[PDB]
Structures are given as C-alpha cells and as structure tokens.
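Ticket reopened. Same input as before:
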Amino acid sequence: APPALWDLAADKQTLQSEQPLQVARCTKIINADSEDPKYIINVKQFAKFVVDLSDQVAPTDIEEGMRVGVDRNKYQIHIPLPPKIDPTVTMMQVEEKPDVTYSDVGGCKEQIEKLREVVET
Amino acid sequence: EAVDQNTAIVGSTTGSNYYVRILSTIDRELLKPNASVALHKHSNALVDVLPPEADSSIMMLTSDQKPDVMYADIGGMDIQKQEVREAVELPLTHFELYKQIGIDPPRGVLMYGPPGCGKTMLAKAVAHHTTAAFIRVVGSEFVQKYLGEGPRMVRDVFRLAKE
Amino acid sequence: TKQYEKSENDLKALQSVGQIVGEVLKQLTEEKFIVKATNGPRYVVGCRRQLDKSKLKPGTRVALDMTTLTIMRYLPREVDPLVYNMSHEDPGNVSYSEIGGLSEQIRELREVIELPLTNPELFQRVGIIPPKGCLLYGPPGTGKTLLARAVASQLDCNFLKVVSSSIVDKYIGESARLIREMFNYARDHQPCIIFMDEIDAIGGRRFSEGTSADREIQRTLMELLNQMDGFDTLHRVKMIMATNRPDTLDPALLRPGRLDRKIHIDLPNEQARLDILKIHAGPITKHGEIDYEAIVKLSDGFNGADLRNVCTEAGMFAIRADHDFVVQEDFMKAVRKVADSKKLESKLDYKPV
Amino acid sequence: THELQAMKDKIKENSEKIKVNKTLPYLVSNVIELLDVDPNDSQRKGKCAVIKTSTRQTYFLPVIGLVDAEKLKPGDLVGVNKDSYLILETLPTEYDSRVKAMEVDERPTEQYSDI
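Engineering reply: fixed in the latest deploy. New output:
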C-alpha cells in the first residue's frame, strides 16, 4: 505494498515532467569567455561545446569552471548544477550525529578548557 | 562461436558481441571458430568472412636490405654450428624426420642477457641464412584507446603465422 | 561590390556536411576495401566513380562519406600543435662561439650538426658516420642547453623543439601517437634535429619497479626509439637529450646509440676571463676608465646569467647613487656580497658519472 | 553610382540569413589550415582546411566562411553548428577553467608598512 501503490502510481505526472530536463546529459565544465553571449564549454564526452545560454538564465551567473545543464539538441545552457565533485571519498569524510558528551572527561580542567575556547567559544 | 543452426554470435569491431541470423547460403565451411566476418551497418547481418585474410595494419619484412653479418665467424668451431644447424634450418621446414624420432620441436626462443646487444644482429643474419616473413612490432605497438581492437590485432598477427 | 554575394554563395557550399576521416588497411577485391576510421571501427564499403588510382595506397589516411562511407578525397594529415614548435629560434654562429667555453666543445657540434647540411660529401667519401645522438648534462657551470641550442637553429631555419610537458599527456595518454606525430612533422623539416630537455622526469628508471606510470614512461620511450630506429631518416637526423644527472637513463639510454655523446662543462681561465667578459658587456655600459678584472674575478664558478646578474646588480646600485656609472669600489662591494651569497647555495654540485 | 546602396540591402538581408546560422555556434572544432588543389580528373580549384572535432572524430570542410584565412594559425575554440560543420567565427581565448586563471585576487587588506 500500500505504501508502494501510490508511490508507483505517480509516474503519470512523472513522464509529463520527464520530458523537460531530460536533455541535461551531460554535466559539462566551461573554459573561457571572449564575449558575453558565447562561452566555450567542455563535457565528459570529451567533446567541447561553444554555446550561448537560454533566456531563462542570466549571463552573470555563469562563472569559469561552473557545471551547468544542457539541451543535447541545441547544446545551449539549461540550469547550473552546484556540485563539481567528488567521486566517492565523501562517505568516509562526512561525519554526522552526536556521541560522547562532555560528561565523559576524566578530570582534566585547564587542558580541555583552553581547547574548548578555541572552537566552541 | 557457432551456437546452433541458422544463427551465430559475432563480436562487433566496437567490441560488443552480436547474435545474428546467418545467411542461408553457406552455413559451415567459412564459419570457423574465430574469424573476421563482414556485417551490415544497421542489421549487422552475417554474410561473408575474409578469405582469410586481409591481415591487419602496420607491416612486415624490411629486414632484407642487406648486408648485416656473415655467419662464417663461428665457422671454425663446427661444434657450435652443429647445434645451431640442427636448431635453425631443420626446425624451419622439415617433416618426415620429426614423426620418425617422435620428438616434437618447440617454438620457444627467449633472449635475455643484454648488455651486450647481440639479438638483432642474429636476426638479420638469419635473413641471410633463410628467407621468411618477419613480423616486427614493439611490445607497446598494439596499445590503443579502446580495448576491443587489442584482442583482434594480436589474433591477426598470430593467425597469419599459421597461415 | 559583388564580392559579398560571392561569399554568400560560399555559404551555400558551407551547407555541405563534413565527411569522416579513416585509415585504410588492405583490399580483399577491387570492389571491397577495408577502411578503419580514427575512432577505431572498420568498414568494408564500396567506392564511387570519381576517385582515382592514388586512393588505394598501402594504408594511407583517407576520408569516408557520411552515408555510403566511400572515399572522396584523401587528406594527408592535420596537426594543431605543430606551429608552437615551429617558432623556436637561437642565434650564432658567433653567439654560440662567444660563450667562452669550453673551447673544444664549440668545435664539437659545429662540424657534428651544422656541417652535414653544407658539406655532406666529407663524411660519405671518407666513410665515417656522423653521430646520431648526444647527451648534455650538468650543472658543473652552465651551458648544458645553450651548447646544443645555438647549433640547433644554426643548421638552418629548421628546428623542432620538444618540451617534457607534452610526453606525460593525460590519463590513458594518447601522446604515444603524438610522439610519433611530433617526430613525423620533425621529418617534415630536413635535415631534422630532435631535442629532449629535463629527461630526469620522463626518463623514469625501472631499477625499483614502481606504479605503471613507470611502464608508460617506457612506452613513450618506445615511441621515441621506433621511428628513430628506421627504416627511415636516421643518420641525417640528430637527436639531443638533456638531464640533471645521468643515473636516470637506465642501461638502455646509458648505452651509446640512442644517447651517444656525453659532454660536461668546465670553468674558464685567466686572460680568458677578459674574453668571456667582452660578450657579457652587451647592453650594460659603465664608466670610461675601468678594469673589469675586479668584477668577474670575485665571482668564480658562476652561471653566465649569474655574472650577467652581477653586472645588473652593480648597475641597479647606480640608481641608488643617482649616477649613470659607479666607481669600482662600490662595484666590488655589490659584486663580492652577492657572489658570496650564491656560493652558500652551491651545494649539490656533485653529479654521478 | 547609387547601385551600391541597392546591393547593400540584399547583403544585410542575406546577413540575416547568416544570423539564424549564427545561433548558435553549437560546438568546438579544432582548426588546421591547409591549402591544396586537386586536378580533375573541369578543373576545380579552392582552399580547403582539415578540421577536427573534440568528440575525437575528424572531419573535412572547406575554408571558412565566414572569417577568412587571415586569422589564424591553426586554432581551436571556434564555434560550429551541429552536423552542418560550418564555422561562423573564430573564438578566443585558450582554455581551461582553473587552468586559465589559477586564482583571482584583487588586492590584500594589508600594506608593506606592516613589517
């Protein structure tokens, strides 16, 4: 499932919204700008693409090294994607949720005090 | 490989193996376990294989320019040449002498020990001794950008050796 | 007036789509040719009626049609980077012989490099072959690059410059064919000259076996040796390599053949210090009555640019004195101080043989 | 003498036909300039430069058309439209991303008087 019934049944609006942004493949990095309208962009397909940007996005929001969306037909810029990075390497880097509160200290005062005022304070 | 009648599987040049209905004309003799067969653009239809073969790219020979080194330097020993004479020209083309004694001659030749150079001197020197097609390639010559062409090149190199 | 409409009619020719290049292999029959695109797929296709007999070839680059994949017209090659290697220039002749030392080393690559073009008959009549390679290491002094560099463009306007940054390429680097491409266009220049600088990086040693990056270093070395092992122009082309220390060459490059000549640099002598002086004068001028021997003697075992720095450092002390020239008393001050500061940084001049 | 203004209208009208071909300079094509004549087999003469594509494919197209051979030595970065393979303009400058500009720094908050 009953939770998976309405879950799977939502594809009717999906396919309607699947037609837009379907062309965003793939993520591409730009290179330089000679003029305002036209920028050179490079994609993971190894093929570099010079193109202008759609009227929906302002030209000032495009900065060198920004991964943006694309329309594979027209190759024009679609929507910017903030993350450039990174393959793996995040899961061991990211740490979440608490544990081991301050009550576990073993009586050291000045030590834990002066290292508390460097960060928490 | 030939899986069954009327159809067989064929790897594409891009590396993706394709399962294609064979043409109803010749189902057998030119099939072969491993061969390069022409396919249609869209349908990838099995029609005709190579003779074999058109061989492959690069080239062979080029060692026939002459002169290099004369073998008469070891001609005085005759103790060294007797083992060489039995290990060179007789293993090249001889037939009835093998099955008689029953010893199967190996193809293995491994040259280590440089320095010094040695080697290619005795290579072009064999060209003076006997005449044969010499396939000369660097160990890195078949390294390419795709891994699908690699298995075909070394196959086309060794399949002309038996041919 | 009407030339604009001519360019408009040229845009009608721009409507034609570009065809796809390919490399032929061989031919099964006259009606079946085997071509292979640069992308790597092979195609057995038919041919059209407008081509000629020169299309067949023994595996020469051709262009394939966008539909029948038939060959229209064959383009020889294309190279983007070549022009950046075309622009290398060095003077001398005189400026090469003006380096002041070593005297016999100027007499070395003079007849070794420049002479084969002007008088090739001298070597072939006697029967002596010119060297096919050389190696210049350092720095016991300076002149590792300049010695081969000035004779490089002195042969003719012909030269091809190679930087070690182009060998590393990228992940799964395709420069294996670019080392072939760069040397292919090096043979476009005759007689060719080949440079290699800072090989202590791309010359990776197989003594202690490391990551496969050391293997692809050897593969790039294979691309160097292959074309230079020809079967093609060999005695005519002169290859040059340079290194900080020649322990990176491995027993292959340490051997002659590939790397033939090994030459180091020595220091000048007395009354020869006045010789190398005259060519270091150049743009910088000083007071009329002077003796330069105090200047150069206080700095011993220095780079030609270091002594050139001492002349400018003594000249940049003039603007503090608001005068054009300076007396030699303040000279020796700025000369001795800076020179003794360079000697403390002179460590690691010992190089393996 | 006034026919210059008459033809000036049709070249701007046909330049508008170039505008729809100038939107957009869809992809990057590495340029290699070449000059060759092919005898046939009446005579066809013209300048044709071999072109690249960053997709790893290589193509063959006549010399552009629009911007002439005056610029430049064989380049890259130029725009070209889809499969039509025509380059409208030669676009600078070089490449790429952080390789072009390592870091952009305006000016520090401190001055040399701080030592």
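The first helix of chain B runs from residue 79 to 87. The CA atoms of residues 57 and 153 of chain B lie 8 Å apart. Please confirm and we'll close it.
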